[PDB]
């Protein structure tokens, strides 16, 4: 009459020896209700993945509760039986015929053990069960030589009539005291591919997020493994960690990794499915799951899609499930225990949608900032996945991987898997189309398929707050030495003069203005900073910050400056100011005025942002209103005029690297003297036009002739008027 | 939110007693810090008094929960740093220091930085640089109400309740409010110009009502506005064809139907032409202060204050000829010039013990005053016409 609908897994305590493969501590009432002999095999449904891990069954001492069951850590590791999963029980299957090979693999070892063996056969098949897809046991205490090793037993050649049983367990028959069929020790490779059994995710899979990975490791290990030390302080234990970031940036994968690597019990929810029409059903479910969380000392709770579960009060008062359940769960978890060991991880997205009623340091102090991976993280993930898929199926050197990572700048973490899989299908398709079903092992991975892959992938991750556009080195930096020296001075002062400023009280002006001609030397500065500074660089476009909705620009400004402040002492760059700055010359709207006042009162109002440095580059400086153009904020001014002869010559040399200067007979000195009124972008465009004219003569060329140079020079003019330079000089004089 | 509460509930018939809880100030934050430090005792950490005072002074907008947040963040950062560096050493030996607290206050980033009532940090008289006549005037104007309300009740004269501050945008407009708040020993209210402005129509009126009846419920005090010229001009500037309701509300609040004898209203504006003729009427805001550029004495005092960090004897400057040469500047201008001169003096060999006269001359010639005589002439004409 008990009718146990569901079961939950539980680790086997007390170690000892016991069964260790066929423990199966289930209450005798459940066994009687299943009309199955206790002294026989038992089957655990584990909801899905048929085969059911058929295993012999034993009896308990009436102390083991009915709800929890034990399946031994060996089977838990074999079948990835994560704690808190749904477990079911049903009738046993048919008796297996026999076992054939059962061969050891000696995982994470160099094999050649001979002495370390010491008759492993008795240990392997001195126990009931022995399921050949996997046995994982402790090293125990054998002879001298300490250490710890594991064994792979996956490979086998036995054939079973029913294909439903993917675990295809068989009986055990070996002779020993205190031998299979023609020895049982051979090979050392990885697990058998034909079974394709699931594997537990490890920390080695996650790459490019180290500075966060050890942070989260410590955040989950200090309370769980050291509860007494933290409780001695008496400052209350943290009961929540915020995992927020753009979708597909590697959050659920780390959730799975930490769930698999932790032996403690973990609670996993599927999200809004708990929400029910009955008002009290969700409350009862929440209080119940909290009861199992608090009754067991080790417990970790996972919550997902909190925004759907907990909508903002002001955003929409839909009703039904609302902040009532949030309040009751917060009250339940507030006083569940005094010290305990409980950590809650919230894998949410864009915390603006997260209800403001979920943010106090008392329970949710820990916040994890996840952003778009940079080129280094993308390259690291590429290397990790290449190592995972092994070199037996592909050939690729390091520089090609680096170039691929550099090419993909705005791509997301999941985009890397997208590209590799798309390259796989493209290679298979081209092989089938061309070679007419040739051996696909020799085709492997090439560059053409990957090139077509990122040509045709078309990701939907272009519009983001982060702007990780590709950078250039000092070779492309064509300008004046004084400008570079000033740049170095004002980017090295806050890095190694913070203590001096604090002692003196001068602090930092934190304001640099870059106004000049629209030719060049106004956009390459962002690359120069992002390259040489080695600090997290944020760039916001002018029209990008503008939005149709009223106040959207203001709130976006709020998030961008709050994240700049929270992202350590760094530099903020705004590309185009003269669209929102002219609130007096043009009528504009109230949103532009609100933006102007917000940016005026946030840079140096109320609170001072000493850590961050604010630099702004604008085309026409007269659009900036004099209300915010006050000494003490953005006081520094740089003329940054047209490039001189040296910068133009350097740009010409850089652009002429592909061509051969010796055969052309040009030193690029007379051309530089003639091309004095142009800009760096103008020089690049003229060089491109000259190259196009040269290659239109006889298709591909190895050199460029003078006639193309004169044709390009006469075809395109400077496009800049001297009166603009005079006006710039007049503005500089008044400043 | 008291506003979100049903106004039917919030009536004196049932809920006449209201307990107002505001943001803790420096003193309250220091008291809470000391109390919690004594709570977890010195057996696990060492924290001398002056470090606690410095931490409390550095805290401006933090809330009661923020102190606990900082404590927990510092403790956990100490734990991780000890585990990373000392390889699981005893945590009692590492205890608590100042650098982890500084890192915690840098990285805490509270979301309560927006508030209707601003607690502007206090400043002492010696740091304040002004003129003797203005100081005597403000002292008299603030001493009259507190110990003359009973005399005015019998006399019936009451108080002018209106003070207007118009002058150059250089200085003597912002730090004056801090000096008044410090010396008066009365709760101070600071609201920015565009802060009262809101996108929603009618939200500004509700904020105006909010601030005035909190001022009324906060005992006879002083109400100061950072700048009025951002909303006072309606016909002259035509600011989004709005603010007329705000102007009418502020006109009828000060002296409409009900008169506020206890409180004193002080106004500071950056330009006189933006004030409408309705406000420029005898009886309300009649008092006007020229509050011009600082004189020689104030500039000399500011230079002496800024030179305290450096050594005057080593530099050799007498702090008189520099003040005489820099006569057309302002207090903020003087501070900025001193900061830039210090930067120039430290560019050579990083930290220095003194600033040379050559660096001061470089600063003076590099940066101009930026002030024109036409605005001074207009201010003088307005003073004569007033
Ligand atoms: N940074 C990354 N590095 C490597 N693989 C990644 C990364 N981000 C995503 N992936 C791949 O894409 C899959 C989906 O990502 P993940 O499971 O982390 O979910 P998510 O989309 O970030 O989370 P959610 O659905 O909660 O928003 C991963 O299982 C992994 O295969």
Author numbering:
A (entry chain A): 28 to 205, 220 to 776
B (entry chain F): 391 to 776
Direct quotes from the study:
The type II AAA + ATPase Drg1 is a ribosome assembly factor, functioning to release Rlp24 from the pre-60S particle just exported from nucleus, and its activity in can be inhibited by a drug molecule diazaborine. Here, we report Drg1 structures in different nucleotide-binding and benzo-diazaborine treated states. All structures display a typical three-layered architecture, similar to those of type II AAA + hexamers, such as p97/VCP and Cdc48, and the NTD, D1, and D2 rings show an apparent deviation from a perfect sixfold symmetry. Comparisons of these structures indicate that Drg1 hexamers transit between two extreme conformations, a planar and a helical state.
To understand the structural dynamics of S. cerevisiae Drg1 hexamer, we assembled Drg1 hexamers in vitro in the presence of excessive ADP or AMPPNP (a non-hydrolysable analog of ATP). To better understand the structural dynamics of Drg1 hexamers related to the nucleotide hydrolytic cycle, we analyzed the structures of Drg1 hexamers obtained from three different samples (ADP, AMPPNP, ADP/AMPPNP/benzo-diazaborine). In these datasets, only a small fraction of particles displays an approximate six-fold symmetry. Most 3D classes adopt asymmetrical conformations, with one or two subunits more flexible than others. An intriguing observation is that the nucleotide binding pockets of D1 domains in the structures of different datasets are all occupied, either by ATP or AMPPNP, even for the Drg1-ADP sample. Although the structure from the Drg1-ADP dataset was not resolved at atomic resolution, but the local densities suggest the presence of ATP in these D1 sites. Therefore, this co-purification of ATP with Drg1 implies that the D1 ATPase site likely has a high affinity for ATP and a low hydrolysis activity. There is no obvious nucleotide occupation in the D2 domains of the structures from the ADP and AMPPNP treated samples.
